[PDB]
Amino acid sequence: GEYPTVDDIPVGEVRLYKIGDGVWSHIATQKLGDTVYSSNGLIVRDADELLLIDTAWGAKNTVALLAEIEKQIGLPVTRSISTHFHDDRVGGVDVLRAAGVATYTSPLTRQLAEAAGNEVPAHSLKALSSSGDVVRFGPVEVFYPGAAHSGDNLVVYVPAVRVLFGGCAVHEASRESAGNVADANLAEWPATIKRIQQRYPEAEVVIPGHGLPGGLELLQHTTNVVKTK
Ligand SMILES: [Zn+2]
Ligand SMILES: [Zn+2]
DSSP, rough: OOOOOOOTTTTOOOOEEEEEEEEEEEEEEEETTEEEEEEEEEEEEETTTTEESSOOHHHHHHHHHHHHHHHTTTOEEEEEEEESSSSHHHHHHHHHHHTEEEEEEEEHHHHHHHTTTTTSSSOOOTSSSSEEEEEEEEEEEEEEOOOOSSOOOEEETTTTTEEEETTTTTTTTTTOOOOOTOOOOTTEEEEEEHHHHHHHHOOOEEEEESSBBBHHHHHHHHHHHHHHO
């Protein structure tokens, strides 16, 4: 049906949304002040297991995520990748570890998470240290396009179905400001977007870290938003 939003996900709950064959997004919320915010991750089937991209933004939500996955898909999450060091990506890693998931991210993300006092995935993805680096991981590619929203942000591509999870380096269409730039590299963000555009020219779906999925237009949209400043 319609992509889940803060206006229709019951409080405390996590939703899944089917994106294509063997690929779902997960959507969770975290109210701060008067505004309820949502956050997206990904789930990708591989053989008879699941690969998780990002936590559901905190321990409580991540427990609910695992329960929703069991209810709706019924296959075990065996590995996860966090796409940068913020709480919407690693908050809940200890829940994943308790559930027997092998948790991964880049070495830089582990370092930044440790410095921030955030939860830290247990394992490093090697050969992701330089912009342009890419590695295969089961049914996905993991690409480090360079600094943008954060110094460490990764994107994840599902080649079989042309789905790009852009994460927080990519803004949703309705967003016209960059939001939280405390860890951002605004100078490098446009070049980082260009690397993503050049690497994944056939992507059919682009999923931002927050908000509605779109297509490749979200990439240039993000650059446009960055240019404001
Ligand atoms: Zn972030
Ligand atoms: Zn984010």
